Structure formats: structure tokens, C-alpha cells
Amino acid sequence: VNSFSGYLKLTDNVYIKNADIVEEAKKVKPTVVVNAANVYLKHGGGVAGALNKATNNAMQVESDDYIATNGPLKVGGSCVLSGHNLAKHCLHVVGPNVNKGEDIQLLKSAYENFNQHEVLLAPLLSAGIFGADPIHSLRVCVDTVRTNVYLAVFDKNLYDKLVSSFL
Ligand SMILES: CS(=O)(=O)NC(=O)[C@H]1CN(c2ncnc3[nH]c4cc(F)ccc4c23)CCO1
Numbered sequence: 001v002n003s004f005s006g007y008l009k010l011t012d013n014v015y016i017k018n019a020d021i022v023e024e025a026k027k028v029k030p031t032v033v034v035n036a037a038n039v040y041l042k043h044g045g046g047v048a049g050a051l052n053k054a055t056n057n058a059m060q061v062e063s064d065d066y067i068a069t070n071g072p073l074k075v076g077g078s079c080v081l082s083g084h085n086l087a088k089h090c091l092h093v094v095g096p097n098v099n100k101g102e103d104i105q106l107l108k109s110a111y112e113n114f115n116q117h118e119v120l121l122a123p124l125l126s127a128g129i130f131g132a133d134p135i136h137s138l139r140v141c142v143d144t145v146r147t148n149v150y151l152a153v154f155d156k157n158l159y160d161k162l163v164s165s166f167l
Pocket of ligand 1: 020021048049050124126127128129130131152153
């Protein structure tokens with residue numbers, strides 16, 4: 001039993017809700033919140049900008065030190081950093097950004113990072129400003145993640161579409 005509330009169950013291990021991931025994180029304080037990161041950990045907009053704003057820019061300060069030490073992430077890769085006031089940990093995962101021409105096949109590699117964590121609160125990778133089809137992203141999630149994932153979808157119209165079209 002965990003504290004996630006109001007989710008629709010899609011599969012044995014995948015759950016979905018129309019929610020603001022920032023508000024969901026502040027209420028649940030999950031062990032892991034996933035950020036929709038880029039390779040530079042520049043949290044300017046989308047999910048990343050919202051998560052970082054909610055940390056009063058502490059996420060960005062920590063991220064800048066990470067990059068200065070380690071260099072950029074790989075597309076499809078991840079790193080574990082602090083969850084600040086939102087979660088114990090933040091798993092920064094880089095999905096491909098279609099608006100940069102990145103290979104959508106890397107989306108599966110991106111979701112594989114979730115399997116290193118037993119339970120996660122996450123957005124749909126490569127959705128939103130990353131330019132991928134969220135219905136495809138949900139399919140890859142379901143077919144790749146084996147650990148327990150709670151997906152927060154900000155847009156109510158999109159949430160209803162994802163549910164209605166789910167196979
Ligand atoms: C690869 S992405 O990060 O750019 N994907 C997207 O942006 C998708 C999904 N986004 C979110 N999903 C869940 N919770 C969210 N809180 C937010 C707060 C914001 F100020 C902006 C977006 C979100 C958001 C919504 C917009 O479209």
C-alpha cells in the first residue's frame with residue numbers, strides 16, 4: 001500500500017491521473033519524482049521549469065554543480081539528484097526532443113531508467129514541449145517500465161484522450 005490517490009489503473013504496474021506533478025509531489029512526497037530533463041539540466045520550461053520553480057531554483061543550483069563536475073547527460077540517460085522539497089530524490093531523465101531532431105527510439109532507453117526504482121511519480125517522457133506523441137509515450141512506458149509508475153498528466157483534455165485510446 002502506498003499514498004498515491006485517485007489514479008486510474010492501466011496495467012499491473014502503471015497508473016495515471018490528471019494532476020499537476022508539482023502539486024502531486026508536494027502532497028505525496030514520493031521517494032522518487034521524475035523530471036523531464038535535457039542533457040544540460042537547464043530547467044527552463046515544461047515540467048522541468050515547473051519543478052525547478054517549486055524548489056525556488058535549488059534544483060537548478062544543484063544541477064549546475066552536477067554538470068560542472070560530470071558534463072552533460074546522454075539522450076536516453078538519467079541521473080539521481082535531490083528531490084528538494086518535492087520528493088526524497090529526483091530522477092532527471094532525458095527523453096528525445098523531437099523539436100531537436102532526436103531519435104524517437106531513444107524513448108525506450110529513457111523509460112528503462114525507471115526500472116532502477118521500485119516506485120516513481122512521473123510525467124510522460126518526451127511529451128509536451130519535447131514534441132513526441134503522448135499516446136506513443138504512454139505505450140512505450142507501459143511496454144518498458146516494470147516497476148510501479150504513477151503518471152501525472154497536466155492537461156485534462158489530454159488525460160481523457162490517453163485513457164479513451166488506451167489498448
Ligand atoms: C517533455 S515536457 O516536460 O515538456 N512535457 C510537457 O510539457 C507536457 C506535460 N507537462 C506536465 N505534465 C505533468 N505535470 C506538469 N506540471 C506542469 C507545470 C508546468 F508549468 C508546465 C507543464 C507541466 C506538467 C504539461 C505540458 O505538456
